[PDB]
Amino acid sequence: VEVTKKGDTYYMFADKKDAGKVVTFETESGPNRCSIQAMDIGHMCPATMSYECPVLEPQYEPEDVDCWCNSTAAWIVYGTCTHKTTGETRRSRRSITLPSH
Amino acid sequence: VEVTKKGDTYYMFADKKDAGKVVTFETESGPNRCSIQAMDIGHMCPATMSYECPVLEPQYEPEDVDCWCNSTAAWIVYGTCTHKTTGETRRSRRSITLPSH
Amino acid sequence: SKYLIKVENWILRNPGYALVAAVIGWTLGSSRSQKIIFVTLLMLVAPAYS
Amino acid sequence: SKYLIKVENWILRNPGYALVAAVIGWTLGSSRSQKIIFVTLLMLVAPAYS
Amino acid sequence: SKYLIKVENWILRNPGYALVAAVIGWTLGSSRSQKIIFVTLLMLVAPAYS
Amino acid sequence: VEVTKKGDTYYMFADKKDAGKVVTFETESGPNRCSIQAMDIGHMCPATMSYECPVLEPQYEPEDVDCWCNSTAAWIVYGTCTHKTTGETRRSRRSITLPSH
Amino acid sequence: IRCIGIGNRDFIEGMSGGTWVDIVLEHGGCVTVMSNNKPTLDFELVTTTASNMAEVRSYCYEANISEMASDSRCPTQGEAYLDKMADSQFVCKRGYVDRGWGNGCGLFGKGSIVTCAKFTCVKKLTGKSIQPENLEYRVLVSVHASQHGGMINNDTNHQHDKENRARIDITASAPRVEVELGSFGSISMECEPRSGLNFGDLYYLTMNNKHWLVNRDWFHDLSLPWHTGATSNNHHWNNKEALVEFREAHAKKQTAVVLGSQEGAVHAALAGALEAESDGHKATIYSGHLKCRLKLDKLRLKGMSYALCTGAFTFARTPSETIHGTATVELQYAGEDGPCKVPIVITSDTNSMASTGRLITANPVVTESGANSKMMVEIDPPFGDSYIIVGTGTTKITHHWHRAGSSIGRAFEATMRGAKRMAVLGDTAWDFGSVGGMFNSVGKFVHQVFGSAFKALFGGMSWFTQLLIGFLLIWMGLNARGGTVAMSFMGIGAMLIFLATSVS
Amino acid sequence: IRCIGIGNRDFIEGMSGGTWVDIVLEHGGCVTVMSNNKPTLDFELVTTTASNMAEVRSYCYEANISEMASDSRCPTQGEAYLDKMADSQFVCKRGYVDRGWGNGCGLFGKGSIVTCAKFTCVKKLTGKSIQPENLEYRVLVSVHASQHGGMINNDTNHQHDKENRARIDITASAPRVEVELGSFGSISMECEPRSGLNFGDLYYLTMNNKHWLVNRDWFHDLSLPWHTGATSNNHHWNNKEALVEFREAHAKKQTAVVLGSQEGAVHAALAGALEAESDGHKATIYSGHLKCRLKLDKLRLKGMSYALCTGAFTFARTPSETIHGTATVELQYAGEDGPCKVPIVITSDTNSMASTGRLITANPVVTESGANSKMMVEIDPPFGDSYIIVGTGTTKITHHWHRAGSSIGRAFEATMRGAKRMAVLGDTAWDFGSVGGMFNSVGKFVHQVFGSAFKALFGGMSWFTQLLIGFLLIWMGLNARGGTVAMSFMGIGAMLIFLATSVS
Amino acid sequence: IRCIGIGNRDFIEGMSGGTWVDIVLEHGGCVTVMSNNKPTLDFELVTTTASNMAEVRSYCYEANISEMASDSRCPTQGEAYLDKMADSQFVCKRGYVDRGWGNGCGLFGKGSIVTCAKFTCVKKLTGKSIQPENLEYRVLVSVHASQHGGMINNDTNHQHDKENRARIDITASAPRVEVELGSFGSISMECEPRSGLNFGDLYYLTMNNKHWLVNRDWFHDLSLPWHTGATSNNHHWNNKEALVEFREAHAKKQTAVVLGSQEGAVHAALAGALEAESDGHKATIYSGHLKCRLKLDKLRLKGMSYALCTGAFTFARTPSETIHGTATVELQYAGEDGPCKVPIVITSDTNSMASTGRLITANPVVTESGANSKMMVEIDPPFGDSYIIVGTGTTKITHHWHRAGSSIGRAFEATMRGAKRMAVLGDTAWDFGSVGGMFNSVGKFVHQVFGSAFKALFGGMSWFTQLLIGFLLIWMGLNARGGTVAMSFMGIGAMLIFLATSVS
Ligand SMILES: *[C@@H]1O[C@H](CO)[C@@H](O)[C@H](O)[C@H]1NC(C)=O
Ligand SMILES: *[C@@H]1O[C@H](CO)[C@@H](O)[C@H](O)[C@H]1NC(C)=O
Ligand SMILES: *[C@@H]1O[C@H](CO)[C@@H](O)[C@H](O)[C@H]1NC(C)=O
């Protein structure tokens, strides 16, 4: 995965292939091993979900969290689409209804 | 993960640790490599979610599916609870109201 | 139907002679209904002279 | 209040003499209201002989 | 407007002679309205002697 | 961080840099390792938040506490302002309204 | 002495020869019954007891789930099937979901998905019904035996002489009870639990060791899982979907969730509800009145044959005054003469020495033979000023007393109260059976309605002048030829003759 | 000849000396105008054209999203913040989520989470308004010139002699138009687009190369994102949350989704809606009537001065009959005499030779000078049996014809139709301006309402007897002293005198 | 000359022998006072001055906090305590928070937590009261001395001859003032600041170098920290919790926050409020009228003894006309004759030479002895056309003038204005003390109410005919035996006799 810093904050460009594996990079504090448990991760495409995932102490189990590193809080970003067809999942099935007349 | 057969159907007892990894077992047809992408998987406890996940052709990529094997359709089962405290998530927040009097 | 239209067209073709015949036959009845029958008689015999 | 209860208890103690005095004073008035005043006079002077 | 103010100022300048003329013309009418017309006549001819 | 005692009670002057790290000092009982998990900690400035954080037994997990030492209860104090501009956050957004007339 | 400190206190007096007498007891008041030769009794109703209540319905506020399973079939396969559908303990829901090549099968259409899971009720509340045959009332009976009147005996462990107090349990099975007061005698009571609070539109709700009463027209309206009362280890439930919230169907599964504890919702809904208490399986209700009929045949006095007291009587404190114009006197006796009758009189002047009032406690007596003993009595002073004298000889003590109000006012108030009581006693007042008790019934109720005024009005209870007044009134009403003047006058005359024939 | 095969066909006849005449045109019918010396004209309204329509609002059924971002802060930190919040193209929502040690911070309290994403409208529909000054009507005018009547000239490319057909565009800017028919002459038309379909409560909806009309009170009721009424490449959308669905909640993020194509919902909702067609930016409406006034001053005949035909006339087929009782005759002429007048008569017997009916086509003539030519004419046969004779000499041909019905029935139907027409012509019927045209107006409309019955009833149109009947009726009404009998009789007499003064 | 360009201008004339005269001054108008032998004066009220205002209450819109501290105790420990609670500058709040083993102690219950912090007011606004003894009015007095009338002297620095203009400060302490006008003389003024704008329900609000006026019932309704006016460096505040917001609930602490600047809220709330201006600590109010009484005893003319002008008079421009029908004339004099009286007459024709109007400026004179000097005068021309003649001999100049309206209209308007003025002068109009001034008072006010019409109506002010008319009217009213005809006639006669006895 690509690791960059824009304005004193770390961005991790993770593609589809790196799904469910940890990665180690370097920060101003030192080495950082960060695990990624992204479930809705997709291929690379303009639709990009980005969310900060926070640092925590190893003496706690993750709860309702799919990203965690231990140097600081790290911002993760990844595309969300299907078979690189430039199309989102859009499976909402709301089926909004309109008045007849 | 544990692999058993009760009545000509294969059950895969998968715990929390084996989350996001594939597993290979044997069937009457031959070897079967089956991948598991369970996102809401929990620890081992009486609350057990079980659902059949189907066989599919290799060319067609999975879509909105978190379990797939290629010998036959395989029934997956795994617990769903928090920190092995014998307690379900029960996070519904419906807040049903009753008539006053 | 078959004869009413013919006599109607005949009346509308020459209404003067028809009205003359009608006013002649009006004063040749003993009762009102008898005068009506006499003028309808003239109305019916009007198309065919024979 | 202070005197009504006393005269009431006195009337209830010996009602015979009270009724005798009342019927005596009833026939000593010129008008009905005058008889009423005379009997209430007897009612009031009843507790204390003096 | 143009003439009312002039005759008004004339009346207000010498009211004695104006009242004399008014009381003279008041007694020279046969009816009340005729007297009113005669005095308004004097009122109108008052500014210009001619 | 600075550690002082004024009237048989310990004050820990912690600046912004020491945020999220433990510190060891000495008391009449012996060495004391005290952890600080202050999230809203700020720079040094007159606006100073001060609160006692209590001693507890190591066999229990903290439930709603961001400061814990094990010799006694220790009073922590730290500034709360932005970029050392001598200005408090004052982000209340109450927007109190007054009657017109 | 249990009837002294009660706000809602009545006074019932029966005929001299009349053994039977009817009364009404309210759950917040008391009744005092007195007679000429019988000792004063005090009846009170403490608590309404409900036991052996049947169960009607039970709800489950907090529940758990386990073993969630689902099955989906896409078009050209029919309806989905699961083996757990036929089981009554597993609840499932059906639905239709869009399918495609991404979900496993080829044809592009929507399929049928079904999802069920077990249902286990961890905590539940119950609803009971109340039948008239289950109710049981408790009435305490006290006797004015010149007791010390000390409130140190609260429970029923000791310090309660069995001849001075008693408890009675009135049940719907046997409404006839026989009360034994020891040396005083025995009485009979027949109570009819009627005209009480309606129990056909009330349900007894038990929840979390607490209890309430609810309306039947709301108990069935509640939207929660329920099941009727059937003795079994595993019960079948209905309408449990209201506690299990199903997540929107996914590509080929459905994850159900269970709601949390609904105790707060029930506590909020039951804010404006009535409460009660319970012991074990029995419940206690503090609302409901009762009608009773007492037969006083074998009841007698205890110290009628005793002698007089030749010792020293002294006041223990300033005599108090109650809201009903009654005066309690607490005496201390010095000397050793044994149980002796207490000579006490009420008059208007120290030299008059004439009884002007009555006593609420009949035959005041000392209970022990000790040197310095104590006793208490309750009397009713006449309106105005009066003197209470205790003892004889040169050692008799006197005390002044005053009471406001008017005799006519008290008479009218008592008459109105008696009229209200007779109106409450709608049924079971008279008897239309064998003849001979109809005149007895009309006399009994006219007495119970007019004696309070008869005693207060007609002079000093000479028993001789009143008969002459009645005779002259009957004569005046007889020698009158006019209508509507002889009937009423003769009726009033006969009423006065009968009221004078009774006890005054 | 464009008015032959039309179900809704009328007949309008004006005064002999009356140049002006008013008519009403319906979008589904036709109008035939005839006179004594003027050639028959046929007016039809083809399409209502709407152009240069302004745009009011556009909705977006199918949309896309991209660059979803979220930010979460737990308690004691305040509200979450994101730089994309200030941008108008990014929509976010706020919420509160439960946090704990498993999420990063310790204090247990609900935190503030915000989530926004871009919004791009991939497909949209538009709504336009219609103003009266934008409408433009198209009316075709045909002339009965004994044309061949062949339907081979459908479009406007060729095979349309410019002296036999014409098109007129009536606009709201200039309602006065001058029509040139070539050799026939010129006419004037003043049309007033009033009393049509209301266009103040209708919106023209364009969607997916299709078009509909909708109600204004319903167009604003639709729940979809919408912009302000201006032309901009990218406009600040409003109420876009209706197309972006957010998940329930998560301890650290929130994943939004976009709805699919809502084309099916709009197609289902617009089932009971009116439809139309469009070309480029112009729209075509098939509903709406029109009122017009025609001035026929320079209109003349074409073959009035021609000679007679001395050739051979022959029928081309059996003469057909239309729904309005009109007979079309298709003749073939042999010989070379040039354009000559067609001698045709309608009588009751072959020896009578007396005109009994009228002709819908005035001055039937042959158009070319060819050897074997063809022509067509349209006539109205009298009720009953009749004989049509064509030609003179020993070569004249005869044909039998029959027509059902009654003269009184047709007269009453035409009178009722004229009354309905005059009722439709509520406004702009008379003129209250300069004097001299008011009597002309009352005479004109009484003629247009009663001439159809006058011609059918009063004998053989002798023009001499009717005047005497009118005179005698006026005399009978004059010598009458009674009320309500002289006014009506004199009015009817004057009406008949005027109707006889006009053309019969 | 300060009263020329004023929209609200009045005219007050007193009795010939009447020294005292009452007037009313409005803050937006002027008053002109004229007499027979006294020079014309012009009074105006410039500004209401408020000084030495006391302070009532002060609010604090923007505040800061510092040194936030908290203390928590869990059950079985009692209430929390902090040393800063007893200090008045530290505000704390108490609460109950859930505790457990995670918070330090064992027992599972909720505890008591207290949290206080300092309070320092960085910015504040103030409220002052206004007392009648603090007000001070300023009135400028001008004298018509035939000044040049140039507006070049706006301020009070120079170009103001001290004998032609003056300023007077009317205070509530000493309402009696003596004004010195130099050579003209001295006057006395007694002004009573009554019937003005109420200052018992108004507060003077100072905020951010701006000032407003507010209602007392609204000033106390505001929900903000406040403190009364006490001279000190540190003040005690009340109800400061309205500016400090505490968080929900935390087990071990509570973080307070302070609100931002509330200047915008106050500016929005004070939108519909009145404004004013201030200099240093004094305030200026532009609303409020005044009543005054002038004593003119030592006031005389300046050029009464001067001679006539034997030079050349010329107009400097076309004479202007004001809204009150007054004509200003600007003259230029050539020659060196010293201060001489200006011979000017107003007539109807050049040969008549009869005074028909009056002069607003008494005794017009030239001020300097220069060769070519200038002067100004203000006169009132009669209704209609008139001729103004200036000078004598063969060098006198004439000018035409016209004025619209009617004498009766102006008379009625002046009568109504005088009636309104006398109605405003409710109190302090008459004197009920010593006798001899009551007739003077009734004559004075009947003059001030009717002289404007008396001068306009009753002829040419001959002073001889009017007496005869009054005598004959008195005689006509005397010889009349009927009621309601002699009293009114005698009253009108006496009124006319008195009005003729006064100055015309
Ligand atoms: C993060 O955790 C990993 C776990 O092995 C460790 O190797 C690494 O040094 C940690 N990073 C730090 C402490 O900065
Ligand atoms: C399933 O797929 C794996 C993919 O490598 C293959 O090795 C295995 O043989 C397959 N099993 C079958 C086709 O039964
Ligand atoms: C606090 O706990 C640490 C745990 O390593 C221990 O080393 C230290 O001595 C303790 N402090 C005391 C008991 O005062």
Side-chain angles (χ1 to χ4, degrees), chain C residues 1 4-6 8-9 11-15 19, chain H residues 348 356 383-384 405-408 456-457 459-460:
Chain C
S1 66
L4 184 140
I5 309 303
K6 307 182 65 178
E8 163 181 332
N9 205 333
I11 292 175
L12 296 186
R13 279 187 184 97
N14 53 4
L19 262 183
Chain H
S348 303
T356 176
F383 284 80
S406 87
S407 315
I408 293 92
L457 278 181

Short mmCIF file of all heavy atoms in Angstrom, two decimals, chain C residues 1 4-6 8-9 11-15 19, chain H residues 348 356 383-384 405-408 456-457 459-460:
data_model
loop_
_atom_site.label_atom_id
_atom_site.label_comp_id
_atom_site.label_asym_id
_atom_site.label_seq_id
_atom_site.Cartn_x
_atom_site.Cartn_y
_atom_site.Cartn_z
N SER C 1 -92.90 7.40 -43.23
CA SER C 1 -91.67 6.72 -43.60
C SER C 1 -91.50 6.66 -45.11
O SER C 1 -90.77 7.46 -45.70
CB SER C 1 -91.65 5.30 -43.02
OG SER C 1 -92.65 4.49 -43.61
N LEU C 4 -94.64 9.37 -46.11
CA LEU C 4 -94.67 10.66 -45.43
C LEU C 4 -93.70 11.65 -46.07
O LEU C 4 -94.03 12.82 -46.27
CB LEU C 4 -94.37 10.48 -43.95
CG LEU C 4 -94.44 11.72 -43.04
CD1 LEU C 4 -95.06 11.35 -41.70
CD2 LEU C 4 -93.06 12.33 -42.83
N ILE C 5 -92.49 11.18 -46.40
CA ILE C 5 -91.49 12.07 -46.99
C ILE C 5 -91.94 12.54 -48.36
O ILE C 5 -91.71 13.70 -48.74
CB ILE C 5 -90.13 11.36 -47.05
CG1 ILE C 5 -89.78 10.76 -45.68
CG2 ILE C 5 -89.04 12.32 -47.50
CD1 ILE C 5 -89.77 11.78 -44.56
N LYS C 6 -92.59 11.67 -49.14
CA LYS C 6 -93.04 12.05 -50.47
C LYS C 6 -94.08 13.16 -50.41
O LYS C 6 -93.96 14.18 -51.10
CB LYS C 6 -93.59 10.83 -51.21
CG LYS C 6 -92.65 9.64 -51.23
CD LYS C 6 -93.23 8.48 -52.03
CE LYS C 6 -93.39 8.85 -53.49
NZ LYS C 6 -93.92 7.71 -54.29
N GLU C 8 -94.63 15.14 -47.92
CA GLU C 8 -94.01 16.31 -47.33
C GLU C 8 -93.26 17.12 -48.38
O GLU C 8 -93.39 18.35 -48.45
CB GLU C 8 -93.08 15.89 -46.19
CG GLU C 8 -92.09 16.96 -45.77
CD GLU C 8 -91.17 16.48 -44.66
OE1 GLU C 8 -91.59 15.60 -43.88
OE2 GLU C 8 -90.03 16.98 -44.58
N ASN C 9 -92.46 16.45 -49.21
CA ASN C 9 -91.75 17.13 -50.28
C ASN C 9 -92.73 17.75 -51.27
O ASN C 9 -92.49 18.84 -51.80
CB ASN C 9 -90.81 16.16 -50.99
CG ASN C 9 -89.64 16.85 -51.66
OD1 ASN C 9 -89.74 18.02 -52.04
ND2 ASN C 9 -88.53 16.14 -51.80
N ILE C 11 -95.78 18.89 -50.58
CA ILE C 11 -96.30 20.08 -49.92
C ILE C 11 -95.28 21.21 -49.98
O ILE C 11 -95.63 22.37 -50.25
CB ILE C 11 -96.70 19.76 -48.47
CG1 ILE C 11 -97.91 18.83 -48.44
CG2 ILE C 11 -96.99 21.04 -47.70
CD1 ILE C 11 -98.27 18.37 -47.05
N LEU C 12 -94.01 20.89 -49.75
CA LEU C 12 -92.97 21.92 -49.75
C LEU C 12 -92.64 22.41 -51.16
O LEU C 12 -92.03 23.48 -51.30
CB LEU C 12 -91.71 21.40 -49.07
CG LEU C 12 -91.85 21.08 -47.58
CD1 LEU C 12 -90.51 20.71 -46.97
CD2 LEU C 12 -92.48 22.25 -46.84
N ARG C 13 -93.01 21.66 -52.19
CA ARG C 13 -92.73 22.10 -53.56
C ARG C 13 -93.71 23.18 -54.00
O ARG C 13 -93.31 24.22 -54.52
CB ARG C 13 -92.76 20.91 -54.51
CG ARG C 13 -91.48 20.09 -54.52
CD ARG C 13 -91.52 19.03 -55.61
NE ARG C 13 -90.33 18.18 -55.58
CZ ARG C 13 -90.28 16.99 -54.98
NH1 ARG C 13 -91.35 16.51 -54.37
NH2 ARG C 13 -89.16 16.29 -55.00
N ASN C 14 -95.01 22.94 -53.81
CA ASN C 14 -96.06 23.89 -54.17
C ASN C 14 -96.98 24.08 -52.97
O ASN C 14 -98.07 23.50 -52.90
CB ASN C 14 -96.81 23.43 -55.42
CG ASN C 14 -97.35 22.01 -55.31
OD1 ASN C 14 -97.23 21.36 -54.27
ND2 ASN C 14 -97.94 21.51 -56.39
N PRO C 15 -96.57 24.91 -52.00
CA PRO C 15 -97.39 25.08 -50.79
C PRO C 15 -98.64 25.91 -51.01
O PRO C 15 -99.57 25.80 -50.21
CB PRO C 15 -96.43 25.78 -49.82
CG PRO C 15 -95.50 26.54 -50.71
CD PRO C 15 -95.33 25.70 -51.95
N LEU C 19 -102.16 24.71 -49.55
CA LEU C 19 -102.90 25.49 -48.57
C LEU C 19 -104.30 25.83 -49.08
O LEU C 19 -105.24 25.88 -48.29
CB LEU C 19 -102.14 26.77 -48.23
CG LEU C 19 -101.32 26.72 -46.94
CD1 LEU C 19 -100.66 28.06 -46.66
CD2 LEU C 19 -102.18 26.29 -45.77
N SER H 348 -86.78 15.68 -59.52
CA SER H 348 -87.58 14.57 -59.02
C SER H 348 -87.98 13.58 -60.10
O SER H 348 -88.23 12.41 -59.79
CB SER H 348 -88.85 15.10 -58.33
OG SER H 348 -88.52 16.00 -57.28
N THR H 356 -84.26 20.97 -57.31
CA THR H 356 -84.88 20.70 -56.03
C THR H 356 -83.91 20.75 -54.86
O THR H 356 -84.36 20.84 -53.71
CB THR H 356 -85.56 19.32 -56.04
OG1 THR H 356 -86.08 19.03 -54.74
CG2 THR H 356 -84.57 18.24 -56.45
N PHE H 383 -84.27 15.22 -49.43
CA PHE H 383 -84.77 14.07 -48.69
C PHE H 383 -85.78 13.30 -49.53
O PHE H 383 -86.72 13.88 -50.09
CB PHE H 383 -85.39 14.51 -47.37
CG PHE H 383 -84.39 14.89 -46.33
CD1 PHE H 383 -83.78 16.14 -46.35
CD2 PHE H 383 -84.04 14.00 -45.33
CE1 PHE H 383 -82.86 16.49 -45.39
CE2 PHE H 383 -83.11 14.34 -44.37
CZ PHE H 383 -82.52 15.59 -44.40
N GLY H 384 -85.60 11.98 -49.62
CA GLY H 384 -86.45 11.16 -50.45
C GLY H 384 -85.72 10.62 -51.66
O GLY H 384 -84.52 10.33 -51.59
N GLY H 405 -84.41 10.06 -43.79
CA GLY H 405 -84.57 11.18 -42.88
C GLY H 405 -85.74 12.06 -43.26
O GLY H 405 -86.55 11.75 -44.14
N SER H 406 -85.83 13.19 -42.57
CA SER H 406 -86.90 14.16 -42.78
C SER H 406 -86.32 15.56 -42.81
O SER H 406 -85.31 15.85 -42.15
CB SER H 406 -87.97 14.06 -41.68
OG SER H 406 -87.63 14.86 -40.56
N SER H 407 -86.97 16.44 -43.58
CA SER H 407 -86.51 17.82 -43.68
C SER H 407 -86.64 18.54 -42.34
O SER H 407 -85.76 19.33 -41.97
CB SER H 407 -87.28 18.56 -44.77
OG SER H 407 -87.39 17.76 -45.94
N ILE H 408 -87.73 18.30 -41.62
CA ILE H 408 -87.92 18.93 -40.32
C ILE H 408 -86.86 18.46 -39.33
O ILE H 408 -86.35 19.24 -38.52
CB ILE H 408 -89.34 18.67 -39.79
CG1 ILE H 408 -90.38 19.37 -40.67
CG2 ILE H 408 -89.48 19.13 -38.35
CD1 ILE H 408 -90.93 18.52 -41.80
N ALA H 456 -85.22 25.31 -45.33
CA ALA H 456 -85.81 23.98 -45.37
C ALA H 456 -87.33 24.03 -45.35
O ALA H 456 -87.98 23.12 -45.88
CB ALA H 456 -85.30 23.15 -44.19
N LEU H 457 -87.92 25.06 -44.76
CA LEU H 457 -89.36 25.10 -44.51
C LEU H 457 -90.13 25.84 -45.60
O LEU H 457 -91.01 25.27 -46.25
CB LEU H 457 -89.64 25.72 -43.14
CG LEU H 457 -89.52 24.80 -41.93
CD1 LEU H 457 -89.85 25.54 -40.65
CD2 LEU H 457 -90.41 23.58 -42.09
N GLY H 459 -91.31 26.59 -48.43
CA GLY H 459 -91.59 26.31 -49.83
C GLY H 459 -90.35 26.17 -50.69
O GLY H 459 -89.30 25.67 -50.27
N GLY H 460 -90.49 26.61 -51.94
CA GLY H 460 -89.45 26.44 -52.94
C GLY H 460 -88.56 27.65 -53.16
O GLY H 460 -87.95 27.78 -54.23
#
